[PDB]
Amino acid sequence: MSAGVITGVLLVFLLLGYLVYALINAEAF
Amino acid sequence: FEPTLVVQALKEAVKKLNPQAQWRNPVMFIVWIGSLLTTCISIAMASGAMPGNALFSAAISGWLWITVLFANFAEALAEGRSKAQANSLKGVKKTAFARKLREPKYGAAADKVPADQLRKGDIVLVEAGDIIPCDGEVIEGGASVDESAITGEAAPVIRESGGDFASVTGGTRILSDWLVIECSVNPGETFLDRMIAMVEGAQRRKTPNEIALTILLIALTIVFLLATATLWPFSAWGGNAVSVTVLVALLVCLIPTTIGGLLSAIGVAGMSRMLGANVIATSGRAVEAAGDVDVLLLDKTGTITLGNRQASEFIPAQGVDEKTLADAAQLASLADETPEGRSIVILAKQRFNLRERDVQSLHATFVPFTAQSRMSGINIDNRMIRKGSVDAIRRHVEANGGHFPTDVDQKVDQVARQGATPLVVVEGSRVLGVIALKDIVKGGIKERFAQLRKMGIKTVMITGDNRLTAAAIAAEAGVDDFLAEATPEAKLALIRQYQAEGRLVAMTGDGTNDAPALAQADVAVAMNSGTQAAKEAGNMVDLDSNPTKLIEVVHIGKQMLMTRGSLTTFSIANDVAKYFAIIPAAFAATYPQLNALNIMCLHSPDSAILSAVIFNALIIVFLIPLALKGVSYKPLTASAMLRRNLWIYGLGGLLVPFIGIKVIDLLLTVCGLV
Amino acid sequence: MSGLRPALSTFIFLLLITGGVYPLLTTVLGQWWFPWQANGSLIREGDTVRGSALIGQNFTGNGYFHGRPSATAEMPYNPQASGGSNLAVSNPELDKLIAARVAALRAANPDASASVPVELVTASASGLDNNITPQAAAWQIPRVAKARNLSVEQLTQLIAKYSQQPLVKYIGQPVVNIVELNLALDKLDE
Amino acid sequence: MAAQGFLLIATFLLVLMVLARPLGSGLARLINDIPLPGTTGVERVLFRALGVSDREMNWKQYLCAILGLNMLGLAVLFFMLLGQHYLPLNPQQLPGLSWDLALNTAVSFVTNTNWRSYSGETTLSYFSQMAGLTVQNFLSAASGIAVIFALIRAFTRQSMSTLGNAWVDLLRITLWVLVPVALLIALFFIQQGALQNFLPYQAVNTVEGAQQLLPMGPVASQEAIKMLGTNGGGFFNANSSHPFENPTALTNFVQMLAIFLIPTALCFAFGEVMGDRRQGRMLLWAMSVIFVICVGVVMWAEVQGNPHLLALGTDSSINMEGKESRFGVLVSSLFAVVTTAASCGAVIAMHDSFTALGGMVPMWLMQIGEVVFGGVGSGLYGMMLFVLLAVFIAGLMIGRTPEYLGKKIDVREMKLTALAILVTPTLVLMGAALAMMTDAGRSAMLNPGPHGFSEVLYAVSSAANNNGSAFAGLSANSPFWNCLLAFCMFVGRFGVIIPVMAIAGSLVSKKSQAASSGTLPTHGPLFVGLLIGTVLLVGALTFIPALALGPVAEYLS
Ligand SMILES: CCCCCCCC/C=C/CCCCCCCC(=O)OC[C@H](COP(=O)(O)OCCN)OC(=O)CCCCCCCCCCCCCCC
Ligand SMILES: CCCCCCCCCCCCCCCCCC(=O)O[C@@H](COC(=O)CCCCCCCCCCCCCCC)COP(=O)(O)OCCN
Ligand SMILES: [Mg+2]
């Protein structure tokens, strides 16, 4: 629970959100 | 793919690297993110800010940059020319000039003001040949405008300064004689500008197979992202954690890149097959969509018919012989250089061997079309031969103290009912008869439309032509439906209608009025004889100009779908088998005893992940050759074809990752690199 | 949507039917038909309860048949804190426990075999296990016979009188009821 | 010993199909909205009184009905546990549960998980056990069977818009299926030794001079419906290895049969509602292959047992560290596999003392999604999500359009199927990661080395998949673990129920087409193999890293 770990956690969550949004909006992506 | 096409694809790949343009590709966007992260990691390790070997993350980053740039390049070949371009329409709109007038009765102060700079209420002058600068109305002078960009037809239409024929259109050419115009639309919204905005702005959907493959891509990449991400906590608990460079590299080497490259591989294979078929496809999805087409909207003038309405049959006027009428027609249209008068001459020559009446220079005044009297002709010797519409000659006869027989009008009505424009002929004050300018269908088309109906493809025929001739040609060709007198808005709205039912539409057009519709269709084949506007909108150009080449385009679309299925099996087998080959190396650092899981006896985690990225790059490069070489295009039922694909391509896609990664790793070790 | 009138009525009706009627009906039938198994299968010595025929107690005397280890919370064989020693196979604490138990069992039964049954050494799942296979119970016959001054044949047929084979030979194990076995042993030595 | 393991598996499956077949033909009437033979006038009177008009419901109304029943049950059970010191049937005046423990128990029971972080002997009082826990056992089982009723109707109905009435579905299911069967099972358990009484705890004085205090609740009814509705909530701490819950080998056999009775009968019923028995048989074959292989693996791993035992001084190395001497090692192995394949949760052995592979395989079965004879109703629509995914990838792999049971499948169904499949492994991995990065979470563990991580992983994978089983060494009775597992259970259950109802909604407004070239048969061994492959590969791609650092790391050294 430091700068690096929090950066990694939030980046993984951003990528999950991006991929889920792409999946829900396959048509555009 | 001429030299220049490859260089443009390379420039557009370099220019698509920017994240804002890469965001629309999930797998390649994650490879882009990981590539950037490893570039930063290598720059850090080289700056000393992070302990470790900078040159290994440098190798990983270089290879991920190669992967992303070749994916961009393959998708710039197979799809960068896909969207419709309104370049010729924009050119006509930008290189137009208007003779602004002062004292607009007639005036003589022609100011060569660019037509774009005209506003409503301003008066303009157009003369023979000069394109109509902008939309508007006529207020003096009568001429024959070439309104071919609105209907698709080629017959000159008379605009005559007061009545119902008084609204010229911007872009259409004027042919007969002078004409002064009163603009009626600010340059923002003309007709030309309206259809420019309608062409660029109509997007083509994605094939449902492509959407399904994208969903599978995103599911697999979510699975791999979860696995690789949560690998850190777990490993950290188990003593020695997994270095962050190994984590990002494992993520961006586990994601299914093969599947990501499958789209552009099948695209470039499809365009190669099309060139083979004598069709210039600019879009890779167009071929697979051609495989999936259910409807076929067709144009009529130029697409189905020759597009110039040759002469068919001289018709007597109840007393004159056909020889006399043929001589009169061949003399009137002797000077006419449009294909219609030329065809009148040709037909008269063959049917009545009138060679005697061909003279380069005989004393004979030539009387061209005027649009005031509305009839062409000649005066050879003590004769006044004229030819033109039925009403024009009616006026001429009634004004010359003659009489207009009624059976001539009966024949005129008949020739109109047969799908042909009748040209009445006169010599003095006695109508000689009618010339049936009929539209010639291109060739043997009923057979091919029957074949298209047998393939399960509806066949509509929308034109901008009369209902009479539209119905005549729909019967004489065998199309299912037909919608006559259709504006470009109508064709585009009909394509939107059809493809809003979930089906895939495929229009075949050759004119500017087809540019909207062709721009929106899924498989828009533009006739190579068509205009540049129609050829810039359509997905593909037909070098044979045959309007039934959708049959062959559909055979090749179905072959590309068999190839897409074979290589989809290969791709899924490949990414999965590569996952098993790649991950055992990642545990060796955490627990010693988990080297037993390293079946392939790879050297280290570093050398396994470097081999993984090299392999992902090479396999994405070699998917294209594999797609170019076809498959056994045999008719096999779903179960038997699934079994064949599984056996051959799935087993190939399992053995390929293990052998490929191990041989790349063996090369890295023997060479000394890792 | 979930209308409140049928959603509330459905929930309340199912609440009453499957919370009062079903338990009440099972309790009525259970007590009426099976009044001994339903009230815990208790053993009695006239007035004082001496345990269930199902639970199994911590026997430590030298003249009794000892069951498995317990691993319950406070004292071994504690019905109020049932549970097993959830010790993995890789936990060295489990090896310490097994070694201690094997040493104790080889010290208590000197004239039996040296290979201790794997049951007497390992702790049951619930902690309240009244059962040991007749092999484990017949590994203790020398010690219990010397302590009780009985003959090995008497204890053999006694253990046999309290073994319980399953219906078919592969859905369970033959097992010795230890509580009842030791109570019968006491009633014998009297 | 291999002959006996084989005989055990064979007799289990044989009796299982003998029972399930008729019950599945009986459930095919409820799916078809036909009143069972005798119950058609009492239905009129009842449904009229209960306010239930038998008006059909679209997928939104149906889903909202199920979620509303579940939220109402959650609120009622939470407040019942929280304030159980006022309510009757409390011989030992036990206090009300904590806010975290009350919340976790409510969420677990409402979601058919029945995860237990407490000790039922010294935590709950007969009222809570009887009036809350087992009422919710019936209601969660009926909610899951009702969701699969709606999905089957969506598959079999042509160009319709309504999936039937949900209130009638729940009332029918409970009153006419769960209740009579549970009553027969309960009275058999009472015959064999299980408890049924509301007496105070019985004060035993041992044969020696010791002391004991036996717990004396109403065990048999809650036991019958915990097994029959694949709930798994045990009355006592040792879930069903307690002599008062599973008194003999016979009741244990009947308990495994009950655990698998309704999932197998739903597969037979699904076969019979499509007029094509081969569909149900295909699902049963796909499930049975995996089940048999897993049972064999666990039996072998447990008969090999603890290596150190033989060296420490014993006669066998058979792993008996967490197993009752009443059921052998083979029966404990079979029950472990059954309970974790069936999304039940009941254990007759401590799964933490299982060997490395013997704990890998049950955990692995929980993590692939519990589609192998899965939970009541939940298992079948999970396997239907995987069947839709298999048909999708088959269509993708041949180039033609997907199609299952004559109805073409859009891309909306693919999006919903992918999200539904992914929601559970996301919960498992993310929850396990969060638990291993916080001191509150990894400190709960009991065993050291990779087995501690196996405990954390098994707990979060069990909660996320609504199983209920636990390695049970994990001290998961803190606010952190309670709230974490409550979130996992809730989201797993209902974020899988929601996309399934959306998929029923889309599918029920379609029409079954005719055969064509893009219609691969969904029966026969080709599609059985394709479906097994899909299931196992999703599970493996997701959890092979996690499993490699727990059970396999422990196995290898
Ligand atoms: C290295 C580690 C492993 C990595 C694995 C990844 C590989 C996936 C692709 C490779 C498969 C190659 C194996 C070759 C299999 C050859 C099949 C055959 O020949 O079929 C013979 C008969 C026909 O039965 P029938 O009487 O005709 O049926 C009458 C009609 N109903 O049965 C059979 O065995 C059929 C067996 C079916 C096996 C197909 C399993 C593929 C699953 C793909 C799912 C991927 C999804 C990704 C997850 C997100
Ligand atoms: C409450 C939601 C109900 C709807 C259905 C619920 C479905 C499951 C959701 C459960 C997740 C609940 C998270 C709640 C966090 C609450 C923390 C808190 O309330 O602080 C307490 C006092 O402070 C503490 O001691 C908290 C101790 C730490 C809490 C640790 C929670 C850590 C979160 C677990 C991690 C994962 C959370 C889920 C995300 C994965 C005070 O609570 P209370 O007495 O007012 O009454 C609540 C009655 N429901
Ligand atoms: Mg045209």
DSSP string, B439-456: PPB-SS-HHHHHHHHHTT
Q: Which of D307, D373, D363, D311 is nearest to D338 (CA)?
A: D373
Residue D220, SS3 per DSSP: helix
Q: Is B643 in the pocket of ligand 1 (CB under 6 A)?
A: yes
- In Å, what is the CA distance from B250 to each residue of B63, B229, B244, B596, D368? 14, 10, 10, 19, 23
Partnered with residue B99 across adjacent β-strands are B112, B125
Q: Which of B81, B63, B83, B80 is nearest to B13 (CA)?
A: B80
As a whole number of angstroms, the distance between CA D84 and CA D95 comes to 7
C-beta of residue C65 within 8 angstroms of C-beta of residue C182? yes
Chain breaks in chain B (C to N over 2.5 A) after: none
Query: Which tokens sit at B22?
Result: 């890469």
As a whole number of angstroms, the distance between CA D335 and CA D348 comes to 7
**CB-based contact (8 Å) between D513 and chain C?**
no
Q: What angle do CA D527, D531, D532 make, to 5 degrees?
A: 115
Query: Which one-letter amino acid corresponds to residue D280?
Result: G
Residue B634, SS3 per DSSP: coil
Query: Which one-letter amino acid corresponds to residue C101?
Result: R
Going by beta carbons, is chain D in contact with chain B, meaning 3 or more pairs sit under 8 Å apart?
Answer: yes
Burial class from Cβ neighbours inside 10 Å (0-12, 13-18, 19+) for residue B501 reads exposed
Q: Which of B291, B293, B295, B328 is nearest to B311 (CA)?
A: B328
Nearest-Å Rg of the Cα atoms of chain B is 34
Burial class from Cβ neighbours inside 10 Å (0-12, 13-18, 19+) for residue B337 reads exposed
> Alpha helix locations (H) across B418-514?
446-454, 467-477, 488-500
E strand or H helix at B68: helix B54-77
Q: DSSP letters along B134-154, please?
A: SSEEEEE--EEEE-HHHHS--
Burial class from Cβ neighbours inside 10 Å (0-12, 13-18, 19+) for residue D365 reads buried
Chain B residues with CB inside 8 Å of D520's CB?
A: 638-639, 642
Angle formed by the axes of helices D166-173 and D2-31, nearest 10°: 140
As a whole number of angstroms, the distance between CA D318 and CA C80 comes to 29
- Strand B525-527, strand B540-542: pairing: parallel
Partnered with residue B136 across adjacent β-strands are B183
Q: What residue ranges do the domains of chain D occupy?
A: 22-274
Query: Which tokens sit at C129?
Result: 């296990």
Residue B252, SS3 per DSSP: helix
The Cβ of residue B361 has, within 10 Å, a number of other Cβ atoms equal to 5
E strand or H helix at C57: none
Angle formed by the axes of helices B26-47 and A3-24, nearest 10°: 160
B230 CA: distance to closest CA in chain A (Å): 9
Q: What angle do CA D475, D477, D480 make, to 5 degrees?
A: 105
Burial class from Cβ neighbours inside 10 Å (0-12, 13-18, 19+) for residue D15 reads middle
Residue C131, SS3 per DSSP: strand
**What is the maximum span of chain B, computed from C-alpha positions, in angstroms?**
116
Give every CB contact of residue D232 below 8 A, 6+ residues apart in sequence. Answer: D113, D114, D226, D239, D339, D344, D345, D346, D467, D468, D469
Query: Which tokens sit at D402?
Result: 């997907």
Which residues constitute the domain of residue A25?
A: 1-29
Identify which of D392, D429, D521 has the shortest CB distance to residue B212.
D392
Residue C48, SS3 per DSSP: coil
Which chains are within 8 Å of A by 3+ CB pairs?
B, D
Give every CB contact of residue D337 below 8 A, 6+ residues apart in sequence. Answer: D291, D294, D295, D298, D361, D362, D365
**Number of separate domains in chain A:** 1
D287-320 b/e with 16+ CB inside 10 Å = b? bbebbbebbbbbbbbbbebbebbeebbbbbbbbb
Query: Which one-letter amino acid corresponds to residue B618?
Result: L
Query: Which tokens sit at D368?
Result: 């692939």
Q: How many CA atoms lie within 13 A of B157 on its CB side?
A: 19
* Cβ separation D541–B212 shorter than 8 A: no
As a whole number of angstroms, the distance between CA B29 and CA A22 comes to 12
Q: Which of B418, B420, B415, B437 is nearest to B338 (CA)?
A: B437
Q: What angle do CA B435, B440, B446 make, to 5 degrees?
A: 140
Residue whose token pair is 């370049």: B87
Q: Which of C22, C130, C175, C170 is nearest to D185 (CA)?
A: C22
Nearest CA in chain A to B217: A23
Residue D223, SS3 per DSSP: helix
C-beta of residue B88 within 8 angstroms of C-beta of residue B642? no
As a whole number of angstroms, the distance between CA B468 and CA B420 comes to 8
Partnered with residue B124 across adjacent β-strands are B100, B181
Q: A-D interface: how many C-beta pairs under 8 angstroms?
A: 11
Residues making up chain B, counted from first to last:
674
C-beta of residue D327 within 8 angstroms of C-beta of residue D252? yes
As a whole number of angstroms, the distance between CA D9 and CA D126 comes to 36
Query: Which one-letter amino acid corresponds to residue D93?
Result: Q
Question: What are residue D224's phi and psi, to 5 degrees?
Answer: -60, -45
As a whole number of angstroms, the distance between CA D255 and CA D344 comes to 11
As a whole number of angstroms, the distance between CA D185 and CA B574 comes to 51
C-beta of residue D248 within 8 angstroms of C-beta of residue C172? yes
As a whole number of angstroms, the distance between CA D223 and CA D516 comes to 50
Going by beta carbons, is chain C in contact with chain D, meaning 3 or more pairs sit under 8 Å apart?
Answer: yes
C-beta of residue D422 within 8 angstroms of C-beta of residue B222? yes
Residue whose token pair is 């201790």: C116
Nearest-Å Rg of the Cα atoms of chain C is 22
C-beta of residue B295 within 8 angstroms of C-beta of residue B505? yes
- In Å, what is the CA distance from D176 to each residue of B176, C8, D39, D239, D269? 90, 20, 8, 27, 16
Q: What angle do CA B225, B228, B231 make, to 5 degrees?
A: 140
Interface test with B, best of A5, A6, A9, A15 (most B CBs within 10 A): A15
Query: Which tokens sit at D318?
Result: 């058979």
Chain D residues with CB inside 8 Å of C1's CB?
A: 60-61, 64-65
Identify which of B219, B565, B639 has the shortest CB distance to residue D418.
B219
Q: Which of B507, B498, B502 is nearest to B539 (CA)?
A: B507
> Alpha helix locations (H) across D307-447?
307-313, 329-341, 356-367, 378-398, 411-436, 439-442
C-beta of residue C56 within 8 angstroms of C-beta of residue C76? no
Structural biology method used: cryo-EM
* Cβ separation D411–B215 shorter than 8 A: yes
Query: Which tokens sit at D218?
Result: 């109403």
Residue B113, SS3 per DSSP: strand
Query: Which tokens sit at D71?
Result: 């939220």
Query: Which one-letter amino acid corresponds to residue D33?
Result: D
- Strand B311-316, strand B431-438: pairing: antiparallel
Q: Which of B554, B585, B572, B586 is nearest to B619 (CA)?
A: B572
The Cβ of residue D144 has, within 10 Å, a number of other Cβ atoms equal to 31
Residues making up chain C, counted from first to last:
190
Question: What are residue D194's phi and psi, to 5 degrees?
Answer: -70, 165
The Cβ of residue B128 has, within 10 Å, a number of other Cβ atoms equal to 13
Sign of the C-alpha dihedral, residues B51, B56, B60, B63? positive
Chain D residues with CB inside 8 Å of C120's CB?
A: none
- Strand B525-527, strand B508-509: pairing: parallel
As a whole number of angstroms, the distance between CA B173 and CA B155 comes to 12
As a whole number of angstroms, the distance between CA B549 and CA B240 comes to 65
Question: What are residue B645's phi and psi, to 5 degrees?
Answer: -60, -50
Q: Whose CA is nearest to atom 27 of ligand 2?
A: D479
- In this structure, the dihedral spanned by the alpha carbons of residues B530, B532, B536 and B542, taken in order and rounded to 10 degrees, is 30
Q: How many CA atoms lie within 13 A of D418 on its CB side?
A: 27
As a whole number of angstroms, the distance between CA B140 and CA B459 comes to 44
Sign of the C-alpha dihedral, residues B498, B500, B504, B507? positive
Check residue D13 and report its DSSP letter.
Answer: H
Question: What are residue D344's phi and psi, to 5 degrees?
Answer: -90, -65
Residue C178, SS3 per DSSP: helix
Residue D488 CA: which ligand 2 atom is closest? 40
Burial class from Cβ neighbours inside 10 Å (0-12, 13-18, 19+) for residue B469 reads buried
C-beta of residue D334 within 8 angstroms of C-beta of residue D8? yes
As a whole number of angstroms, the distance between CA B75 and CA B125 comes to 49
The Cβ of residue D277 has, within 10 Å, a number of other Cβ atoms equal to 13
The Cβ of residue C98 has, within 10 Å, a number of other Cβ atoms equal to 25
Residue D340, SS3 per DSSP: helix
Query: Which tokens sit at D20?
Result: 């399930």
C-beta of residue D134 within 8 angstroms of C-beta of residue D174? no
Q: How many CA atoms lie within 13 A of D426 on its CB side?
A: 21
D415 CA: distance to closest CA in chain A (Å): 6
Check residue D510 and report its DSSP letter.
Answer: S
**CB-based contact (8 Å) between A15 and chain D?**
no
Nearest-Å Rg of the Cα atoms of chain D is 23
Partnered with residue B316 across adjacent β-strands are B433
